Amino acid sequence: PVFHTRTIESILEPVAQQISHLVIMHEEGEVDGKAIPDLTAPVAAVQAAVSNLVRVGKETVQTTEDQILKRDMPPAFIKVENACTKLVQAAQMLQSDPYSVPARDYLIDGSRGILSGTSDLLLTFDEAEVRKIIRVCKGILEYLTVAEVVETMEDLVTYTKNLGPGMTKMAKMIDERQQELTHQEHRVMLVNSMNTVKELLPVLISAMKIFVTTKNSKNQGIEEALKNRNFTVEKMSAEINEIIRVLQLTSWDEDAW
């Protein structure tokens, strides 16, 4: 199986691979003539865990201001609850008739449903983390649009003192995100893009210092200095937009649950 992040992989494994296997062993049809042992107590443990998960999820629904969580968490609760009802039914059916083929299939379907709803909740939380990172990226893009307004050395010192720490915060968030992505190609793209942006930052500040000097001296170097600053801002902005794009990618190879 291929998951989006190491957090999700750490939770969905080992059961995702177990269910993936069990489905190949019981595609649909299930003619083995074997009995399933009493699942009443193991199923009661799943039901208790599912009810607890829905309770915990509802704490976020009741407190969050993020409307995309209030919208996406409740359908996952319904999926796990309905899937668990199937699992309880299946265990009751199998306790009455351990050799039942139709019940073994409620059982497998209920298990898939629990895994799917749990995966949906985890992806909702993941998507909210990504939105938080993108807000920071967009804030840097916005402050980069202010570079063109800087026409004095005092304003350049102020600009540098605001942008440096902001870029450090963005870099920290990208570093913390990339480290847990499972796709090496995406980690490499994020690390390379963030390094390009970090390397362009002193180039930008230097270009702004040249622009301010040319402005103050009222010399013939202003249009060249301005174009060189704009070129650097354009490249930094293109790179941050590439980060934003990579942060939202889901590879074709990721298993859907």
């Binding site: 059961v15 865990a49 998960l53 999820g57 699992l87 909740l121």
Partner: peptide, 23 residues
């Protein structure tokens, strides 16, 4: 100090894994 969604989800998948280990 309250249980996280991650801890609660791991309880779910552990219990589901333990159940499936019986088939």
């Amino acid at each position: 100090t309250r249980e996280t969604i991650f801890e609660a989800s791991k309880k779910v998948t552990n219990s589901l894994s333990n159940l499936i280990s019986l088939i």
